[PDB]
Structure 1
Amino acid sequence: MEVIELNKCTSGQSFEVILKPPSDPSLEEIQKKLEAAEERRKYQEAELLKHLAE
């Protein structure tokens, strides 16, 4: 019913119609998580090369 905030221009026009009213991690912590996961790979890769060494 009620049209408001009607704005117009050459390209078009915009408005609002109301029908009824109502009723972060740091650079430190990131680089630590990435490198902690890299050491888990290095450990796993080591256990492989150890297993292959035996």
Structure 2
Amino acid sequence: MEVIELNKCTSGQSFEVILKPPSDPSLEEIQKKLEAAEERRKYQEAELLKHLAE
């Protein structure tokens, strides 16, 4: 019903119409997660090359 904050210009116009009132991990933490996953890859590859050695 009420039309507030009406701004006009050449490009267009904008407004608000209210009908009713109311009632992060660090760089070191990233590297420690990424490298621990490379450790588990390297362990699995080594265990595979150990099995193939046998």
What TM-score, normalized by structure 2, do the two folds share?
A: 0.99
Give runs of ≥4 in structure 1 deviating > 6 Å: none
1:2-50 Cα offsets, whole Å, 9 max, x none, are: 0000000000000000000000100000000000000000000000000
Identity of aligned residues (%): 100
What TM-score, normalized by structure 1, do the two folds share?
A: 0.99
Give the number of equivalent residue pairs: 54
RMSD: 0.3
Where does structure 1 lack aligned partners over 5 or more consecutive residues? none
